[PDB]
Every structure is written in structure tokens, then in C-alpha cells.
């Protein structure tokens, strides 16, 4: 390698890496629209605000897609995507939908602001298969009446908000609340973070609910877990309840589901540069450290429910532990990692005593 005496120059190259967090926001909407140019017919388009929506698209006169989308920006900011399609049973682009979401790496939430039931349930079954290979989605849904929809029967990532919300327009028109409830997830992760359940947040700009729910049938609907939009006298309308669908003690809460969904997506994006490196011992201690310094920063900002000890993570990557010799030959690595998330506090009980 060295023949002429001279002086040779050489550096040490290494893929040494660290992990940084992205945002859990900016969904796409699959309602019907009216594009202005023919290349905007069937492709995903990034929308930054309400201003550039008025340039690319239009507001028509009879027509609820332009009304349901401006209520998204009044609640919480952030960009959003949209996928215009015209026919509900057009299973051409509906089959060609899930292989367009994967090429954009960010997509987290999923929604559909279209009013009727025949259009929404055709959508919810089209991309229902793309939820169980663990890439990181979390959709929203609405209920046509007092029970949950059956297009997605039992899954760890859905959320149902029962009573639909109306809005005045020149008779006031109703609106399925899956549109404007996506914007209220964009405020909670701003100041409070991911690990806070959005309940006490106040809906920003509405007249009234369509049907008035009371506390005696709140008792029935809070099991078989579906959420509810409530009305109060002093503070107006407010969202209420933060429970997911399937009710084992594994994941019954929205933030405990969404905390593990965001912690995986940040470490999986940064291990992708190191995917063909040798399986020696100095690679093991460099990966185990960059995961250790990610959960420790997240622990000391109040998101892992551990006490003043260290017991919130046990990431280990060794060869005697967690592996053995014969799966090195069919090249593998095993990352046993585990957290201890925090639960929301509901049902506060006082129990006064005399002494």
C-alpha cells in the first residue's frame, strides 16, 4: 500500500451516529377537492398554510371540504398534505394509495373530513392493511351512531370521537369531527409534548354540538372505549376522554400508544446509515451508548414514569446476553430495549376522613 517513502496522509472514518427527534404531526386528508391544474389530479401535494391552498385550489359554491380544512388551521398550525380523489369505488387509485404514502417518510396521522358514510368506509378499508407492519401510523375515525364503526374492528391504533359538530354557513351544516381534531394534536405536542393526553384543550371556534350528551349515558360510552365531545356552561365545548379501542392493560391510552410509536421512528431512521457494518464488539458499545443517551434525555424531562433511580431502560446488545453464536452466522443483531411510560391521571378520589 506504501511504496514511495514520502509522507502519507490518512484519516479514521466511522459511521458514529446519534439520534434526534422529529415531529408527530402533519397528516394527509383523502377527501374530494377541485384541483386547478391536471397534474394535481392524483398525486400527494404539500400545503404549507391557508394562503397557498387558495392559490393551488379554489373555494366553490353549491361543498364542505373547503370549510372543514380552514378549521384545521384555526386550531393548530403546521403543514398538511391532501390526496384528491373523485369516485368512492374507484379502486384504481385506492389500490395505488398505500404505495404512495411510504415514499414520503413523515406521515403520522390519517383522517378523512368527508361527511357521508359510503365514502369514508370505502377509504378506511382500503388502507386498513397498512397498519400492522409497524411502520408507525395512527388514524382517526368517526361513528355514525352510538357504537363504533366496523371497518377497522379491533386495533391498537384507532380513535373514535362520537358526536359530530356543526358550523354556521350561508341552515348550519353538520361536519364529521375527524378534520378539526387533527389540529388539536398539533398544539399538545408543541408546549407539553407527546406524553400528555389532549383533553383539557378547548376547541377553537364552533357554535354547538349536534346532539347534547349527558353524564348518565357517558357512563355507557366510556367503556367499549370511544371518546366524546362534551359541552360545559362556563368554558364551552371541550374534548373529553383519551382511550383507544382495544381494552387490555397493555395499551388503553392514547399517549402510551403514541409514545412508543415516536420513540421507535427516531432510532430506526438513524440506524439505517449503519446497516452493513461488521458485528464486532466495538460496534456494540457504540450503539448501546447512543440509545442510552436518548432515553436519559427523555427521562429527565418528565416522560418516563420512573422514580429517582435509573430503572427506566435496560438496553443491552451483548453476545453472551441477548444473543448467541449461531445467529451471528446468519447475520443478525438483537436490541432488547424497554421503557416505563407515564399514565394519565383520571378518576381523582379524595376520601376525606375524621382522623
Amino acid at each position: 500500500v506504501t511504496s514511495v517513502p514520502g509522507v502519507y496522509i490518512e484519516e479514521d472514518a466511522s459511521p458514529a451516529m446519534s439520534v434526534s427527534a422529529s415531529a408527530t404531526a402533519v397528516p394527509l386528508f383523502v377527501a374530494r377537492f377541485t384541483p386547478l391544474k391536471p397534474e394535481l389530479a392524483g398525486v400527494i401535494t404539500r400545503i404549507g398554510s391557508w394562503l397557498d391552498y387558495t392559490i393551488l385550489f379554489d373555494s366553490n359554491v353549491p361543498p364542505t371540504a373547503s370549510v372543514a380544512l380552514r378549521l384545521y388551521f384555526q386550531n393548530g398550525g403546521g403543514p398538511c398534505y391532501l390526496y384528491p380523489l373523485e369516485k368512492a369505488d374507484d379502486n384504481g387509485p385506492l389500490a395505488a394509495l398505500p404505495d404512495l404514502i411510504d415514499e414520503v417518510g413523515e406521515i403520522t396521522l390519517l383522517a378523512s373530513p368527508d361527511p357521508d358514510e359510503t365514502y369514508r368506509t370505502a377509504v378506511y378499508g382500503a388502507l386498513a392493511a397498512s397498519l400492522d407492519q409497524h411502520k408507525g401510523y395512527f388514524l382517526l375515525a368517526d361513528s355514525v351512531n352510538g357504537d363504533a364503526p366496523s371497518a377497522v374492528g379491533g386495533s391498537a391504533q384507532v380513535a373514535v370521537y362520537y358526536p359530530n359538530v356543526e358550523v354556521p354557513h350561508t341552515a348550519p351544516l353538520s361536519l364529521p369531527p375527524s378534520a378539526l381534531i387533527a389540529g388539536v394534536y398539533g398544539k399538545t405536542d408543541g408546549e407539553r409534548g407527546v406524553w400528555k393526553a389532549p383533553a383539557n384543550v378547548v376547541l377553537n371556534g364552533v357554535s354547538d354540538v349536534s346532539v347534547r350528551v349527558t353524564n348518565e349515558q357517558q357512563a355507557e360510552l366510556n367503556p367499549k372505549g370511544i371518546n366524546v365531545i362534551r359541552h360545559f356552561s362556563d368554558r364551552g365545548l371541550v374534548v373529553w376522554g383519551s382511550r383507544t379501542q382495544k381494552d387490555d392493560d397493555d395499551w388503553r391510552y392514547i399517549p402510551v400508544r403514541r409514545l412508543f410509536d415516536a420513540a421507535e421512528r427516531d432510532i430506526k431512521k438513524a440506524l439505517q446509515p449503519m446497516v452493513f457494518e461488521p458485528n464486532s464488539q466495538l460496534t456494540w458499545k457504540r450503539v448501546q451508548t447512543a440509545i442510552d443517551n436518548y432515553l436519559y434525555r427523555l427521562w429527565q424531562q418528565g416522560a418516563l414514569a420512573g422514580n429517582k433511580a435509573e430503572e427506566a431502560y435496560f438496553v443491552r446488545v451483548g453476545k453472551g446476553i441477548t444473543m448467541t453464536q449461531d445467529e451471528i452466522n446468519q447475520g443478525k443483531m438483537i436490541i432488547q430495549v424497554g421503557m416505563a411510560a407515564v399514565r394519565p391521571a383520571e378518576f381523582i378520589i379524595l376520601k376525606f376522613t375524621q382522623d
Binding site: 446497516v275 452493513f276 457494518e277 461488521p278 458485528n279 464488539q281 460496534t283 447475520g331 443483531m333 436490541i335
Partner: protein, 300 residues
């Protein structure tokens, strides 16, 4: 690159002209160019050949490749793939019997197109990825994620068409990602046996003996005695200890990583000493790529 331009003043379109222009542009060094009838002579003479690539020749190249393997020259070729567009409807195997099964070589399908000029056979693209690898960090690391420049693949393959061509044989597609682009992907040789996969673990054993065999030519006809046995044993492990700290072969307590032994009754007993033979054996455990990374979440 200097004498290549004065020999070939005009830019051409042939497969060899597009191959050497891709070798030198990613660094490169002393490279030869022989016709496809005289590989069996050129390897046995020049004493430094490592790679036999195919610049768009398949039929008469596969015979001359397995010829010099038959004498045991310890070489590592690499081949081309099929021409264009496996439809993917069916037939995972019938595109793979025209390739000589051996632990030497890969195929590198997708036929990068070199958007400046005409097409480039993918043996040149694979050979450029090895050049900026061994200069940067060793030979035990696979030509796997180091990016090439100026070459775009003609096709967009899939995420899952890699999957059905990963067992049995080793298509080793060339796929473009977001961010890092036009990178190679997958380092697998032709067999699937648990001793000989993973192209870098082949080239590690291929280059750890061509320097011992080159050096011991000045030690033949030496007296087969006791001061010889304690000197070769003390000279080999001083080379492996320099290779263990560099991360080439993995293991703590470096008596566990390799072993060297030479003696009078552990090996080469008294009668085969009288025939002159001096036999040794050394064995070492190399590193292997972390091709699959699985990770498990829990609650504790």
C-alpha cells in the same frame, strides 16, 4: 488516467471504454486489460491479480474464470446480471442457471446507465465500490454502503423484489435511497452455506494467506528443527495481533480469536519429518456483516 487518454484520444461508446472511465474516476490504480482468450495465461504470470470483472462478456468468460480456480490461484471474480427487466410475475430460478456456482463472485443486476453517456456494465460499478473501501477502512468491511458518484440506475426495483432473490443465490441489487443515492446494496456470494457467505468474509481469508505464501518463499530448504518452529510461531501471531486491534477479526482474550500451533508430535510425526514435510495449521474467526437488525420493545 494519463496514458489512457493519449492511447484513446476520442470518447467512444463501447463497454470497455465506459468501464475504465468509471474505474479511474473513483480513484483506482494499476489495472490491466486482456482479451477473453488469455485469462488463463495472464493470471499465472503477473502474480498480483485480485479481481476478474466482466465488461459485458458472459459466454467465454465463465469458462476462463473457473479454469484458474481449478489450479487454486485464490482469486475472486465478479459477474454481470441479466440484461433488462425481470418482469417479476414468476420464474425466480430460470435466470440463474447460466452462472457458475462457486464461492467466488456476484452478479449485480440493475445495469446502471451513466446519464452522461451510454450504459455501464455493473461489474465496473461494483469494482469502483471496492476501491474507495479498502483505501478508506480495511478489506474486512463489505463494499456495501459506500456511495458511488455520477451513475444512476436505469430501473427502480422495489422494496420486496430484493426479498425473493435473497435466498439460494445473491442477485445483490443496486438501489437508490433518499439522501444517500445510487448506492450498492447487499453483499452475498453464490452459495448459501454457513461457512461461505458474506463477500467480505471470503476476501478476508483470500488476502490473509497471499501475504504469508509470498513471504515463506525465502524460508524453504531451511533446517526443520526446534529453533525454526519457535520462530514461525512467533512471527505469525505478531501479524494477527496487529490485525485484531484494527477490528478485522472479533473476539476478546486474543487467545480465543485465533490459534497457532507447530511442533513435533502434536503435528507432523517422525516419519513424515523424514520425508521433509513441515506441516502447520492455524485457525481464526473473522467478522460478519450485520445484514439484519431486529429490535424488541418491552415494559420493565
Amino acid at each position: 488516467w494519463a496514458e489512457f487518454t493519449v492511447e484513446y484520444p476520442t470518447p467512444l461508446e463501447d463497454a470497455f471504454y465506459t468501464s475504465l472511465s468509471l474505474w479511474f474516476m473513483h480513484g483506482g490504480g494499476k489495472c490491466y486489460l486482456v482479451n477473453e482468450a488469455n485469462i488463463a495465461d495472464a493470471v499465472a504470470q503477473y502474480d498480483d491479480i485480485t479481481l476478474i470483472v466482466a465488461a459485458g462478456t458472459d459466454t467465454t468468460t465463465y469458462t476462463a474464470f473457473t479454469t484458474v480456480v481449478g489450479q487454486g490461484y485464490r482469486i475472486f471474480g465478479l459477474f454481470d446480471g441479466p440484461k433488462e427487466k425481470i418482469a417479476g410475475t414468476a420464474k425466480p430460478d430460470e435466470v440463474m442457471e447460466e452462472y457458475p456456482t462457486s464461492p467466488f463472485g456476484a452478479v449485480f443486476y440493475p445495469w446502471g446507465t451513466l446519464a452522461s453517456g451510454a450504459a455501464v456494465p455493473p461489474s465496473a460499478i461494483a469494482a469502483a465500490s471496492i476501491t474507495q473501501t479498502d483505501r478508506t477502512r480495511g478489506v474486512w468491511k463489505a463494499p456495501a454502503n459506500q456511495a458511488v458518484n455520477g451513475v444512476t440506475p436505469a430501473f427502480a426495483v422495489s422494496d420486496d423484489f430484493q426479498g425473493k432473490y435473497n435466498q439460494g443465490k445473491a442477485l445483490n441489487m443496486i438501489r437508490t435511497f433518499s439522501g444517500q443515492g445510487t448506492v450498492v446494496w447487499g453483499a452475498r456470494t453464490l452459495e448459501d452455506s454457513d461457512n461461505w457467505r458474506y463477500i467480505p468474509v471470503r476476501r478476508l481469508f483470500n488476502a490473509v494467506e497471499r501475504d504469508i505464501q509470498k513471504s515463506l518463499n525465502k524460508l524453504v530448504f531451511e533446517p526443520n528443527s526446534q529453533p525454526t518452529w519457535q520462530r514461525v510461531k512467533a512471527a505469525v501471531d505478531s501479524y494477527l495481533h496487529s490485525l485484531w486491534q484494527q477490528g478485522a477479526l472479533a473476539g476478546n482474550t486474543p487467545a480465543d480469536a485465533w490459534f497457532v500451533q507447530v511442533g513435533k508430535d502434536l503435528t507432523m510425526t517422525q516419519e513424515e519429518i523424514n520425508q521433509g514435510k513441515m506441516i502447520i495449521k492455524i485457525g481464526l474467526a473473522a467478522v460478519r456483516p450485520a445484514e439484519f437488525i431486529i429490535l424488541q420493545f418491552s415494559q420493565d
